[PDB]
Amino acid sequence: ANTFLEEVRKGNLERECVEETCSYEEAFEALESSTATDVFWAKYTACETARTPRDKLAACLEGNCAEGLGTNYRGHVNITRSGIECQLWRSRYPHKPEINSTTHPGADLQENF
Amino acid sequence: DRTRYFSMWNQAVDSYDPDVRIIENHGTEDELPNYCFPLGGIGITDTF
Ligand SMILES: [Ca+2]
Ligand SMILES: [Ca+2]
Ligand SMILES: [Ca+2]
Ligand SMILES: [Ca+2]
Ligand SMILES: [Ca+2]
Ligand SMILES: [Ca+2]
């Protein structure tokens, strides 16, 4: 955002929307891949507490750790705290989830992760 | 005469500049700004 003459130089997704509080416009401009754009947005949002420092935002981009209540987690662990198998979020077996893939598509709902 | 130069005996007087021995200072007319623009014509630009 700062260093006004940045909009004439080429840019770095990391030298605009990472090491600096950025516009989703410059984010949109730099991303275009609107799926990953939503991903980066989701990042930003969850990383709202990971805005600083820089390496914290880098880790929040890695996504292996759940931020706060766990909106950002994108790992491969699909097991409950006590070893019970996780039911498919979209499937109705054995429970029909009021809160499921249709209601939360932006969390990247995997098989049972 | 002595102003004129003859190029045979190197006959050419040596005189200073009358505006350097005495500096008649007057400032400089600069009522208008002299700006310098971008090369393309527009700098910053957005998207629409
Ligand atoms: Ca900037
Ligand atoms: Ca900027
Ligand atoms: Ca900078
Ligand atoms: Ca731009
Ligand atoms: Ca930019
Ligand atoms: Ca950097």
UniProtKB/Swiss-Prot annotation, chain A:
Disulfide bonds join C17-C22, C47-C60. The modification 4-carboxyglutamate is found at E6, E7, E14, E16, E19, E20, E25, E26, E29, E32. Residues 1-46 form the Gla domain. Glycans are attached at N78, N100. It comes from the Eukaryota. Residues 65-113 form the Kringle domain. This is Activation peptide fragment 1. The lineage of its organism: Eukaryota, Metazoa, Chordata, Craniata, Vertebrata. The gene is F2.
